[PDB]
Enzyme design. Structure first.
Site, PDB file in Angstrom:
ATOM      1  N   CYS A  39      30.561 -38.573  22.724  1.00 14.73           N
ATOM      2  CA  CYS A  39      31.279 -37.738  21.738  1.00 14.73           C
ATOM      3  C   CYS A  39      31.322 -36.312  22.256  1.00 14.73           C
ATOM      4  N   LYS A  88       0.865  -1.211   0.000  1.00 14.05           N
ATOM      5  CA  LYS A  88       0.000   0.000   0.000  1.00 14.05           C
ATOM      6  C   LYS A  88       0.893   1.250   0.000  1.00 14.05           C
ATOM      7  N   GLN A 119      33.944 -31.609  21.714  1.00 10.46           N
ATOM      8  CA  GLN A 119      33.578 -32.863  21.017  1.00 10.46           C
ATOM      9  C   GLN A 119      34.864 -33.581  20.585  1.00 10.46           C
ATOM     10  N   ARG A 120      35.152 -34.731  21.192  1.00  9.93           N
ATOM     11  CA  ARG A 120      36.371 -35.531  20.949  1.00  9.93           C
ATOM     12  C   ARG A 120      36.329 -36.042  19.518  1.00  9.93           C
ATOM     13  N   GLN A 138      12.738  -2.394 -11.961  1.00  8.46           N
ATOM     14  CA  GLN A 138      12.414  -3.171 -13.193  1.00  8.46           C
ATOM     15  C   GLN A 138      13.159  -2.511 -14.355  1.00  8.46           C
ATOM     16  N   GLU A 139      12.908  -1.223 -14.564  1.00 11.65           N
ATOM     17  CA  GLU A 139      13.434  -0.473 -15.727  1.00 11.65           C
ATOM     18  C   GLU A 139      14.960  -0.408 -15.677  1.00 11.65           C
ATOM     19  N   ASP A 192      31.810 -36.096  13.170  1.00  6.48           N
ATOM     20  CA  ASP A 192      31.363 -36.479  11.814  1.00  6.48           C
ATOM     21  C   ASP A 192      30.827 -35.195  11.187  1.00  6.48           C
ATOM     22  N   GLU A 214      15.887 -36.222  22.095  1.00  5.18           N
ATOM     23  CA  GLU A 214      17.157 -36.690  22.700  1.00  5.18           C
ATOM     24  C   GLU A 214      17.547 -35.765  23.865  1.00  5.18           C
ATOM     25  N   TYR A 256      24.900 -40.286  28.664  1.00 12.69           N
ATOM     26  CA  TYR A 256      24.880 -38.836  28.961  1.00 12.69           C
ATOM     27  C   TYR A 256      23.895 -38.538  30.084  1.00 12.69           C
ATOM     28  N   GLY A 267      14.907   2.214  -5.512  1.00  8.70           N
ATOM     29  CA  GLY A 267      13.561   1.674  -5.801  1.00  8.70           C
ATOM     30  C   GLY A 267      12.568   2.799  -6.055  1.00  8.70           C
ATOM     31  N   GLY A 268      11.279   2.475  -6.140  1.00  5.54           N
ATOM     32  CA  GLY A 268      10.713   1.167  -5.869  1.00  5.54           C
ATOM     33  C   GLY A 268      10.716   0.252  -7.083  1.00  5.54           C
ATOM     34  N   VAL A 293      11.096   1.444 -10.738  1.00  5.11           N
ATOM     35  CA  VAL A 293      12.487   1.928 -10.952  1.00  5.11           C
ATOM     36  C   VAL A 293      13.419   0.705 -11.045  1.00  5.11           C
ATOM     37  N   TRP A 333      19.382 -43.687  18.523  1.00  2.64           N
ATOM     38  CA  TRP A 333      20.191 -44.617  19.361  1.00  2.64           C
ATOM     39  C   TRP A 333      19.887 -46.085  19.071  1.00  2.64           C
ATOM     40  N   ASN A 362       8.239   5.964  -4.014  1.00  3.48           N
ATOM     41  CA  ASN A 362       9.358   5.744  -3.062  1.00  3.48           C
ATOM     42  C   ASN A 362       9.508   7.047  -2.250  1.00  3.48           C
TER      43      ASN A 362
HETATM   44  N1  LIG Z   1      11.914  -2.709   0.274  1.00  2.00           N
HETATM   45  C1  LIG Z   1      12.666  -1.817  -0.367  1.00  2.00           C
HETATM   46  O1  LIG Z   1      13.886  -1.935  -0.447  1.00  2.00           O
HETATM   47  C2  LIG Z   1      12.032  -0.681  -1.052  1.00  2.00           C
HETATM   48  C3  LIG Z   1      10.660  -0.600  -1.025  1.00  2.00           C
HETATM   49  N2  LIG Z   1       9.977   0.450  -1.571  1.00  2.00           N
HETATM   50  C4  LIG Z   1       8.499   0.382  -1.700  1.00  2.00           C
HETATM   51  O2  LIG Z   1       8.204   0.323  -3.072  1.00  2.00           O
HETATM   52  C5  LIG Z   1       6.875   0.860  -3.310  1.00  2.00           C
HETATM   53  C6  LIG Z   1       6.953   1.907  -4.391  1.00  2.00           C
HETATM   54  O3  LIG Z   1       7.257   1.213  -5.643  1.00  2.00           O
HETATM   55  P1  LIG Z   1       6.366   1.376  -6.959  1.00  2.00           P
HETATM   56  O4  LIG Z   1       4.916   1.462  -6.573  1.00  2.00           O
HETATM   57  O5  LIG Z   1       6.819   0.366  -7.962  1.00  2.00           O
HETATM   58  O6  LIG Z   1       6.863   2.829  -7.418  1.00  2.00           O
HETATM   59  P2  LIG Z   1       8.287   3.569  -7.501  1.00  2.00           P
HETATM   60  O7  LIG Z   1       8.711   3.940  -6.142  1.00  2.00           O
HETATM   61  O8  LIG Z   1       9.203   2.756  -8.352  1.00  2.00           O
HETATM   62  O9  LIG Z   1       7.813   4.912  -8.238  1.00  2.00           O
HETATM   63  C7  LIG Z   1       7.118   4.819  -9.515  1.00  2.00           C
HETATM   64  C8  LIG Z   1       6.891   6.208 -10.060  1.00  2.00           C
HETATM   65  O10 LIG Z   1       8.186   6.760 -10.371  1.00  2.00           O
HETATM   66  C9  LIG Z   1       8.111   7.539 -11.543  1.00  2.00           C
HETATM   67  N3  LIG Z   1       8.934   6.916 -12.555  1.00  2.00           N
HETATM   68  C10 LIG Z   1       9.502   5.673 -12.513  1.00  2.00           C
HETATM   69  N4  LIG Z   1      10.288   5.422 -13.528  1.00  2.00           N
HETATM   70  C11 LIG Z   1      10.234   6.576 -14.287  1.00  2.00           C
HETATM   71  C12 LIG Z   1      10.853   6.941 -15.502  1.00  2.00           C
HETATM   72  N5  LIG Z   1      11.650   6.153 -16.202  1.00  2.00           N
HETATM   73  N6  LIG Z   1      10.626   8.184 -15.963  1.00  2.00           N
HETATM   74  C13 LIG Z   1       9.822   8.986 -15.237  1.00  2.00           C
HETATM   75  N7  LIG Z   1       9.171   8.753 -14.099  1.00  2.00           N
HETATM   76  C14 LIG Z   1       9.419   7.511 -13.676  1.00  2.00           C
HETATM   77  C15 LIG Z   1       6.644   7.662 -11.892  1.00  2.00           C
HETATM   78  O11 LIG Z   1       6.197   8.794 -11.148  1.00  2.00           O
HETATM   79  P3  LIG Z   1       4.858   9.535 -11.665  1.00  2.00           P
HETATM   80  O12 LIG Z   1       3.771   8.511 -11.379  1.00  2.00           O
HETATM   81  O13 LIG Z   1       4.635  10.827 -10.860  1.00  2.00           O
HETATM   82  O14 LIG Z   1       5.078   9.847 -13.157  1.00  2.00           O
HETATM   83  C16 LIG Z   1       6.126   6.329 -11.387  1.00  2.00           C
HETATM   84  O15 LIG Z   1       4.720   6.393 -11.215  1.00  2.00           O
HETATM   85  C17 LIG Z   1       6.396   1.334  -1.936  1.00  2.00           C
HETATM   86  O16 LIG Z   1       5.607   0.307  -1.355  1.00  2.00           O
HETATM   87  C18 LIG Z   1       7.745   1.632  -1.259  1.00  2.00           C
HETATM   88  O17 LIG Z   1       7.659   1.870   0.139  1.00  2.00           O
HETATM   89  C19 LIG Z   1      10.691   1.531  -2.032  1.00  2.00           C
HETATM   90  C20 LIG Z   1      11.949   1.391  -2.405  1.00  2.00           C
HETATM   91  C21 LIG Z   1      12.808   0.350  -1.787  1.00  2.00           C
HETATM   92  C1  LIG Z   2      15.352   1.396   3.651  1.00  2.00           C
HETATM   93  C2  LIG Z   2      15.495   0.285   2.620  1.00  2.00           C
HETATM   94  C3  LIG Z   2      14.268  -0.606   2.707  1.00  2.00           C
HETATM   95  N1  LIG Z   2      16.651  -0.560   2.898  1.00  2.00           N
HETATM   96  C4  LIG Z   2      17.416  -0.957   1.906  1.00  2.00           C
HETATM   97  N2  LIG Z   2      18.384  -1.818   2.205  1.00  2.00           N
HETATM   98  N3  LIG Z   2      17.341  -0.566   0.607  1.00  2.00           N
HETATM   99  C5  LIG Z   2      16.456   0.368   0.323  1.00  2.00           C
HETATM  100  N4  LIG Z   2      16.339   0.788  -0.927  1.00  2.00           N
HETATM  101  N5  LIG Z   2      15.609   0.843   1.271  1.00  2.00           N
HETATM  102  O1  LIG Z   2      14.661   1.766   0.899  1.00  2.00           O
HETATM  103  C6  LIG Z   2      15.137   3.141   0.779  1.00  2.00           C
HETATM  104  C7  LIG Z   2      13.939   3.997   0.508  1.00  2.00           C
HETATM  105  C8  LIG Z   2      14.014   5.309   1.255  1.00  2.00           C
HETATM  106  N6  LIG Z   2      13.464   5.320   2.627  1.00  2.00           N
HETATM  107  C9  LIG Z   2      12.094   4.815   2.739  1.00  2.00           C
HETATM  108  C10 LIG Z   2      11.378   4.790   4.066  1.00  2.00           C
HETATM  109  C11 LIG Z   2      12.030   4.731   5.281  1.00  2.00           C
HETATM  110  C12 LIG Z   2      11.300   4.650   6.463  1.00  2.00           C
HETATM  111  C13 LIG Z   2       9.929   4.614   6.451  1.00  2.00           C
HETATM  112  C14 LIG Z   2       9.277   4.649   5.254  1.00  2.00           C
HETATM  113  C15 LIG Z   2       9.995   4.714   4.070  1.00  2.00           C
HETATM  114  C16 LIG Z   2      14.144   5.998   3.629  1.00  2.00           C
HETATM  115  C17 LIG Z   2      13.488   6.910   4.484  1.00  2.00           C
HETATM  116  C18 LIG Z   2      14.191   7.661   5.413  1.00  2.00           C
HETATM  117  C19 LIG Z   2      15.561   7.545   5.469  1.00  2.00           C
HETATM  118 CL1  LIG Z   2      16.434   8.470   6.650  1.00  2.00          CL
HETATM  119  C20 LIG Z   2      16.251   6.693   4.632  1.00  2.00           C
HETATM  120  C21 LIG Z   2      15.553   5.950   3.696  1.00  2.00           C
HETATM  121  O1  LIG Z   3      26.811 -36.929  18.768  1.00  6.70           O
HETATM  122  C1  LIG Z   3      27.549 -37.573  18.018  1.00  6.70           C
HETATM  123  C2  LIG Z   3      27.813 -38.984  18.096  1.00  6.70           C
HETATM  124  C3  LIG Z   3      28.654 -39.551  17.215  1.00  6.70           C
HETATM  125  N1  LIG Z   3      29.299 -38.828  16.238  1.00  6.70           N
HETATM  126  C4  LIG Z   3      30.170 -39.518  15.278  1.00  6.70           C
HETATM  127  C5  LIG Z   3      31.657 -39.216  15.394  1.00  6.70           C
HETATM  128  C6  LIG Z   3      32.262 -40.494  14.816  1.00  6.70           C
HETATM  129  O2  LIG Z   3      32.163 -40.593  13.394  1.00  6.70           O
HETATM  130  C7  LIG Z   3      31.357 -41.535  15.465  1.00  6.70           C
HETATM  131  C8  LIG Z   3      31.781 -41.941  16.857  1.00  6.70           C
HETATM  132  O3  LIG Z   3      32.713 -43.028  16.752  1.00  6.70           O
HETATM  133  P1  LIG Z   3      33.956 -43.029  17.712  1.00  6.70           P
HETATM  134  O4  LIG Z   3      34.666 -41.731  17.481  1.00  6.70           O
HETATM  135  O5  LIG Z   3      33.356 -43.188  19.081  1.00  6.70           O
HETATM  136  O6  LIG Z   3      34.789 -44.209  17.368  1.00  6.70           O
HETATM  137  O7  LIG Z   3      30.047 -40.918  15.513  1.00  6.70           O
HETATM  138  C9  LIG Z   3      29.052 -37.466  16.067  1.00  6.70           C
HETATM  139  O8  LIG Z   3      29.563 -36.771  15.192  1.00  6.70           O
HETATM  140  N2  LIG Z   3      28.181 -36.921  16.976  1.00  6.70           N
END
Ligand SMILES: NC(=O)C1=CN([C@@H]2O[C@H](COP(=O)(O)OP(=O)(O)OC[C@H]3O[C@@H](n4cnc5c(N)ncnc54)[C@H](OP(=O)(O)O)[C@@H]3O)[C@@H](O)[C@H]2O)C=CC1
Ligand SMILES: CC1(C)N=C(N)N=C(N)N1OCCCN(Cc1ccccc1)c1ccc(Cl)cc1
Ligand SMILES: O=c1ccn([C@H]2C[C@H](O)[C@@H](COP(=O)(O)O)O2)c(=O)[nH]1
Ligand SMILES: NC(=O)C1=CN([C@@H]2O[C@H](COP(=O)(O)OP(=O)(O)OC[C@H]3O[C@@H](n4cnc5c(N)ncnc54)[C@H](OP(=O)(O)O)[C@@H]3O)[C@@H](O)[C@H]2O)C=CC1
Ligand SMILES: CC1(C)N=C(N)N=C(N)N1OCCCN(Cc1ccccc1)c1ccc(Cl)cc1
Ligand SMILES: O=c1ccn([C@H]2C[C@H](O)[C@@H](COP(=O)(O)O)O2)c(=O)[nH]1
Ligand code: MET
Lengths: 532, 531
Positions: free
Chosen positions: A417, A34, A436-437, A149-150, A440, A309, A357, A143-144, A147, A331, A86
């Site tokens: 063991c 959403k 573990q003496r 996909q493209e 395996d 066990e 044990y 993202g999202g 972005v 066992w 995004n």
């Molecule tokens: N889990 C994660 O890592 C991330 C999650 N998210 C989540 O992703 C979702 C948003 O993704 P989604 O709905 O796919 O939308 P996007 O965030 O990818 O935004 C899509 C919009 O971007 C603009 N746009 C995208 N590509 C182009 C282009 N080539 N040229 C011009 N405008 C472009 C358009 O804006 P306009 O419609 O105004 O023309 C389009 O409607 C949210 O749920 C968000 O919170 C966000 C990023 C990272």
């Molecule tokens: C944050 C997230 C999901 N983590 C990774 N690893 N890669 C991303 N692309 N991410 O999304 C970045 C989107 C931007 N974002 C989205 C966001 C964060 C919190 C709550 C709603 C949305 C954000 C907002 C505030 C700060 Cl300070 C930094 C990043």
């Molecule tokens: O919890 C256990 C019990 C046995 N073994 C394996 C180790 C050896 O291959 C064999 C035990 O034979 P001896 O080392 O006791 O000869 O069973 C394990 O890895 N874990």
């Protein structure tokens, strides 16, 4: 190519969407809902987002400027580029994004429709024009979905900073399916917890399809034997993906890199039966239980058996039938007439595993009779004692639980063991070492990591502590020969963000847990591998 | 200066000389004897000296082509005095892949061998380099050449091998002016032709880079300067911090001390003593290459060798040690300490079922330190030895002191929980898991004990020791060791000594104090760990 000259990157974050489940990298694809984000705050994702989109390095600018000028014949900040929706999702007090050159694509809206200090462009070629005119470090597409996909279908993205949010939310827009031919993952971050969800940070790359101390390095490596010998007869070229990654910071790689190490450098030995292994000696793995549950992702793992066990252990039980009647076969082989007889346990009943044990945890030093005996107030209740030292003497260097009862070894179905757990408490947090003496790597370890991680959570909870580190010391680390092929498959997989473990919060004594008190949320995994 | 511009370097190798003695860098000076080297052949050095004097980088020569000529297959320059030239034989002449200069004021190019070079006075080189195309210039000695090159501050870097044995010498290296050069790299320690050696690097003092920003993003959640919890002052370890390459194995111990000081959790153990603490480390020392006795301060081993013999005999009797002036266990045997452990019925220095008793009698009912326990309980020591010999691929070769039944009866529960052994290709490794680790006082000794043990077990099993692997659990610095360890972190380790066991001993029970000998121990001065 346009995106290499102008350094145009995408950065996004994707949750799982509400659709035996198949998981691939399209699992993380949900972008927004959403016209806002599908989650409230994931502050660690914002912190990371902030860090990537604001980081600049002035020394590297000279070469970027030259590069850009050359392709045109002729306080530093990054550009960020936003879909209009995004841009309209952003709280007003945070726009325009601080310390960044803000660009917004729109048709419905023009320059005049904005108060802010933002470049409005009609079209993508208008970004390329602008970037040829601005002094800027890097350009990030924010993202999202429209972005994103493209920008990809125009091959204008050099890298994708993609955050995997490992929870599910309602989404009405999605990140496009990334083409594997077009992009491969080159780096995967550590796994964190933020706002009740785990996440990690992965980087996709556009595909092919004083410096005297530089030299001291090579002098100092003069004796290194392996110069592409094929030390062990595994072929690096089979680990193409594994070797192609640059930053392998997912903690699953602590386990994956030891299998690499054992395979590349292991000693060839013929173990207890004649089966054959590659083996190494001494490793440590550390998992951050406050940041995740380290259930391996590069193959499917079920934890019902190993949780049952762990409860069987805690109850002090040695009766193999109890597991069999819950359809846990962990066992079964170790309780047969034959297996027991061959251990010279001729007077031991089928499935009576002896002083293993459970017995040692609740009764270390009691004379073991049979699996049905009442052992109440016999031998040392280690488990009770370690809970008592955590609660009342947390700084003790003596909180150990030891299964290795030297006197009882020969009377056990097999010697344990998992030798021992030590505990460590700082600032209301519990860390656990398990030694573990015998390990395996293919079959046993991945479950062992899980058993002891769960156990640490349980001990933390009943002690009113948070879990910190589960630390796994491997003595004799071995890969069975006939696991190798399965393991080369697994190593070429890229871990998913770890799941989380939830214990029923009401359980307050270690004795009081049941199977339904344990929930693994958000287990994303590759398909199951038969190791054999 | 000339040197920093023209990349003029000296490669040398210095042994110790045949002069309660005290060590410094000038310990290693011996260069030559009777117009040859002082030692037969040290082939790991011969190899080092090859790789260093050949190797060149095409890419990086650019920053030198325009710098020496911003001043007025690409081979390397090597300079040697005629006696250093004639000191070497003929099949090797003129050292292949190298511009062979010589520093002789006598015999000219028509006199001498191949299509090489010569000069006649020190200066006469100054400009020769300014002419030809070369990667770096290496001064290969001898003493006379080194001497006059260090006087005139023409040496940017010294690539100095420490040969850690003693030899008869006639010529020496100059005392390296400690304020004029500092060590900025130190290599792994190596055995070669029955001696340890390492490679250190002295410098002159002064009084796909897209995947590189990805590294900064992955560190986005790390920590700055109030983060890195340090009332320790990094700048107080300038020497530790100035080293680029810290490959000497002692750095495995030193790096853990730095890690605990910098990232350690402040905790207040038992008493109000105070420690910095971390959980879970693993150090590994190659016993085949050296004996890991810390060199950044003085350590004594008679006491810990006696303790080890005492363990092997199964003793629990503190007096046996006290009568040999090993006082490691004295505090743990007092009436006061026994009474505070609730051991009111324990004789003074009756330490209870500790290491020795668990190693030879595990599960036997402890009575007192004088009772005969023969063939009572599990002789784990005999068992783990018979496993190594009969079943080396076993993963059950554990020696465990942590008897849960007996902990309360022990004067204190053990720090050293267990040993595990591993055998591959006639070589023995040992892991020891340490539950509680005093990095300042205990660990330095604990490494030596279990290294020694590994040698003993290996020898009575006819195996070569490989690795001692030390796994630390609760690793702590005592807060009042901090000043001393800061001093310790700023000392450059010396090449480790070796251990020689009496080869005749093939039963673990048959060692005596005179079967253990430490060889070539070179160490910085003793440090009191407090004050
Ligand atoms: N889990 C994660 O890592 C991330 C999650 N998210 C989540 O992703 C979702 C948003 O993704 P989604 O709905 O796919 O939308 P996007 O965030 O990818 O935004 C899509 C919009 O971007 C603009 N746009 C995208 N590509 C182009 C282009 N080539 N040229 C011009 N405008 C472009 C358009 O804006 P306009 O419609 O105004 O023309 C389009 O409607 C949210 O749920 C968000 O919170 C966000 C990023 C990272
Ligand atoms: C944050 C997230 C999901 N983590 C990774 N690893 N890669 C991303 N692309 N991410 O999304 C970045 C989107 C931007 N974002 C989205 C966001 C964060 C919190 C709550 C709603 C949305 C954000 C907002 C505030 C700060 Cl300070 C930094 C990043
Ligand atoms: O919890 C256990 C019990 C046995 N073994 C394996 C180790 C050896 O291959 C064999 C035990 O034979 P001896 O080392 O006791 O000869 O069973 C394990 O890895 N874990
Ligand atoms: N361990 C090590 O690192 C190494 C040490 N060595 C050992 O060192 C010993 C030989 O060294 P050392 O005795 O010092 O002799 P050198 O090898 O240093 O030879 C120096 C010679 O060069 C000439 N020379 C000296 N000073 C000057 C000058 N200022 N200008 C021009 N020519 C000069 C003289 O030859 P002339 O006047 O006759 O022309 C002099 O005899 C041997 O034992 C050798 O094995 C050798 C190699 C390396
Ligand atoms: C060899 C040595 C000691 N190594 C170091 N690290 N530092 C030096 N500069 N060295 O001096 C080498 C000079 C002459 N020499 C040493 C030598 C060899 C045999 C007998 C006497 C001396 C030699 C012979 C053959 C080759 Cl390929 C290279 C060097
Ligand atoms: O061999 C030993 C014995 C003791 N300690 C240190 C660890 C602690 O500082 C203390 C042992 O006391 P507890 O950890 O048991 O409280 O001595 C060692 O490092 N090594
Ligand atoms: C039928 S046994 C071989 C199966 C093997 N684990 C695959 O891969």
């Amino acid at each position: 190519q346009v995106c290499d000259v102008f350094d145009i990157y995408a950065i996004c974050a994707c949750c799982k969407v509400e659709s035996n489940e198949v998981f691939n990298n399209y699992t993380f694809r949900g972008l927004g809902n959403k016209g806002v984000l599908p989650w409230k705050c994931i502050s660690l994702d914002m912190k990371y987002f902030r860090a990537v989109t604001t980081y600049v390095n002035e020394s590297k600018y000279e070469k970027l400027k030259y590069k850009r000028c050359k392709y045109l014949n002729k306080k530093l900040q990054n550009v960020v580029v936003m879909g209009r929706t995004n841009w309209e999702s952003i709280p007003k007090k945070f726009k325009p994004l601080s310390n960044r050159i803000n660009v917004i694509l729109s048709r419905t809206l023009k320059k005049e429709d904005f108060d802010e200090d933002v470049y409005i462009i009609n079209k993508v070629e208008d970004l390329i024009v602008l970037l040829g005119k601005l002094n800027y470090y890097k350009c990030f597409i924010l993202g999202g979905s429209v972005v994103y996909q493209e920008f990809l279908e125009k091959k204008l993205i050099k890298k994708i900073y993609f955050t995997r949010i490992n929870s599910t939310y309602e989404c009405d827009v999605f990140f496009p399916e990334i083409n594997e031919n077009e992009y491969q993952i080159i780096s995967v971050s550590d796994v964190y917890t933020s706002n009740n969800t785990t996440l990690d940070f992965i980087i996709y790359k556009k595909t092919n399809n004083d410096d005297e101390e530089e030299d001291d390095f090579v002098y100092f490596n003069f004796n290194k034997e392996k110069e592409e010998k094929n030390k062990n007869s595994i072929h690096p070229n089979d680990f193409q993906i594994y070797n192609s990654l640059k930053y392998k910071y997912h903690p699953e790689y602590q386990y994956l890199n030891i299998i690499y190490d054992i395979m590349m450098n292991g000693n060839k030995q013929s173990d207890r039966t004649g089966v054959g292994v590659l083996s190494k000696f001494g490793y440590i793995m550390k998992f951050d239980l406050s940041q995740y549950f380290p259930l391996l992702t590069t193959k499917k793992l079920f934890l019902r058996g190993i949780i049952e066990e762990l409860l069987w252990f805690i109850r002090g039980e040695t009766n193999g039938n109890t597991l069999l009647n819950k359809n846990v076969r962990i066992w079964e082989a170790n309780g047969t007439r034959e297996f027991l007889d061959n251990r010279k346990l001729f007077h031991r009943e089928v499935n009576d595993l002896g002083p293993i044990y459970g017995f040692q945890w609740r009764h270390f030093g009691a004379e073991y009779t049979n699996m049905y005996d009442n052992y109440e107030n016999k031998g040392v209740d280690q488990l009770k004692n370690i809970i008592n030292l955590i609660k009342n003497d947390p700084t003790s260097r003596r909180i150990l639980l030891c299964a290795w009862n030297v006197k009882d070894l020969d009377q056990m179905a097999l010697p344990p063991c998992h030798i021992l757990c030590q505990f460590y408490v700082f600032d209301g947090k519990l860390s656990c070492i398990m030694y573990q003496r015998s390990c395996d790597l293919g079959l046993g370890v991945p479950f062992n990591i899980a058993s002891y991680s769960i156990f640490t959570h349980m001990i933390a909870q009943v002690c009113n502590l948070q879990p910190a580190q589960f630390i796994h010391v491997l003595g004799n680390a071995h890969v069975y020969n006939n696991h190798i092929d399965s393991l080369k498959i697994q190593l070429n997989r890229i871990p998913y963000p770890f799941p989380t473990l939830k214990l029923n919060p009401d359980i307050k004594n270690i004795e009081d847990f049941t199977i339904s008190d344990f929930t693994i949320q958000n287990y994303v995994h590759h398909e199951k591998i038969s190791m054999d």
